[model samples]
Target: HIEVVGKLGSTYGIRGWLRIYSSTEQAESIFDYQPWFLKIKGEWQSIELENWRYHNHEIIVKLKGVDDREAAQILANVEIGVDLSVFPELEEGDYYWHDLIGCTVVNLEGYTMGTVTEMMETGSNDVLVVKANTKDAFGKQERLIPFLYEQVVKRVDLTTKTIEVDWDAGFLEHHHH
Candidate 1:
């Protein structure tokens, strides 16, 4: 799982320092590794991180081959991805979106609602889009379940590939969008 962490922003100065457009919260952690893989305009290439330091509030880096502004500009908008081996260990009960995408969703009473297809981030919280495998007599095939833990969702068992929810079957029929 080589996840894309960020991209290279515009060149900072004439000395090959390029600003980073990090998508992760711990942006400075990207500087911890050398020989980062960059995807530029559909091509992939590995570049070495030479030096990096925080200037004011921006995170900047100096690539080994980028010694001038022209060379730095060429790397702008390049995607920066890191191997999953270096990613921080997740806390208990926390799951990656990919892990939840294909899991089955069921209610507390063991009523199978559907399988999670995808997730979307609402302004308040994330919502799970589940696709029903079989119609519940009403012939509806989609269920939009709120991903609020303790309120809507009860627990997720990755090993079992299921999500146990607190809502009743009627809740899904009436509220799914």
Candidate 2:
């Protein structure tokens, strides 16, 4: 899978240098991954990073063969994706947001709460936005559960694609109405 790690912003200066907005945890590390891919005209085309540097506050980069403003302008607002294999491996218990998106969430009693459709980052911790199964008994179409491992979250089995939590089914209904 190709994961989007950054985006090419407006052309910088008169050269082919373009501003970059990185989505990586450490913004500067986006340069560590080489051979970025961009979707051009509905096709994934690979492009090499000729050079990159931090310009004052923002990051800018130069692409091989793209040496003028016109060439850079063509890539503006394009998302930069890198091969998933190129990403650095994380420590145990750490997971990329993409990995958790489709996993099913079950409570302690093995009650199927829902499937994780998205993740949210709050000031304290990340939260899972689960999409409840249609015609839920509790009338819950969706639920936001904290990703608090060892506390609210009990286990995450990637192979089984399931996340077991300590949440209560009827507990959150009080806030629904």
Candidate 3:
């Protein structure tokens, strides 16, 4: 599997250097993965990273065989992906966002809250965006719950595709208009 980690921005100069827009938590860490893949014309083509460097606040890279601005322009806006096998293994309690998404969420009271649709980073903590299975008893079609392990999030069972939480279904109704 290939996980998109960054994108090739416009060509940097007359050379083959291209600016990079990274999606990793630590932007520069996007380079740690090997043998980048560029999605061009609906096909994933592996490319070689010749060199890269931090340019101002962004990153610029030179790809093997792409020797001029003309060549680099062809790669502009292409997605840069890396093989999933190159992804670093996290500790037992740590979970990647991709793994958490789509899991069913249930509260301690056995209320089937929703399924995780996406995750948001709120500076202080991560929040899970759950899309309700139906307009729930609280009339909520969606909910955002903080991913505070052992506190709000009690358990995550990937094998069962379920997340058990300590959140109260009625709590959202009290906080919104």
Candidate 4:
């Protein structure tokens, strides 16, 4: 499943506009795909794109089903999503953060690290929260790893659903082994 990486942060101006907090680093990423899927009440429904443009650097969108402020309130807190199947063919070396959330963390030599739990934004950098598979080890403990290109990760194995990380430097220094 393509993860829901964004949410309807709030209703912007009247006329069914939404303020979206996008998962991508930039505000423009919310519009990368067309026909956004809105998740409400545990179901995903499609919303047609009508009018969308930049207003003060935030995304202002018009969904087909909604046309007024009262109508837009139904979408409050709804998460905007797209199917993984519909994900645009990414470049060979690039990956979406949603796709990596569930992958097992491992190393090139096959040493298991943990299972990806979630992603976080620290205002300056993004990090991955990995909960070591507690089924085999001491129960439920998590570590946050910086998602920098050089410091923590290597290759993501999409086929096998795993991420090979370079944890030698440690995501949390002086923390754990």
Q: Write the per-residue lDDT of candidate 4 for residues 1-177, one digit (tens) a residue.
A: 656767775787777887767775665766767668888778888877777787787777788888888888878878888765754775432357888888888754455668888877767777878877655333436667778775578777789998877664243334333
- Local lDDT at 138 for model 1: 45
TM-score between model 4 and native: 0.45
Give candidate 2's whole-model lDDT. Answer: 0.85
What ranking emerges by TM-score with the best candidate at the front?
Answer: 3, 2, 1, 4
Q: What does candidate 3 score on TM?
A: 0.48
lDDT of 2 by residue, 1-177 (tens): 788898899999897999999899988878878789998887778999988888899888999978999988999999898887654675433457778989999887667899999888766567999999997768889999998879898998899999999887765533322
Alpha-carbon error at 42 in model 3, in Å? 0.8
lDDT of each: 0.80, 0.85, 0.87, 0.73
Report how far off residue 173 is in candidate 3 (Å).
70
- TM per model? 0.45, 0.47, 0.48, 0.45
Over 31-121, each residue of candidate 1 has an lDDT whose tens digit, in order, gives 6555688997676678888888887888888888899999988888889987657556654334477689889998767778788998877
Worst 10 residues of 4 by lDDT: 168-177
Error of 3 at 77 (Å): 0.3
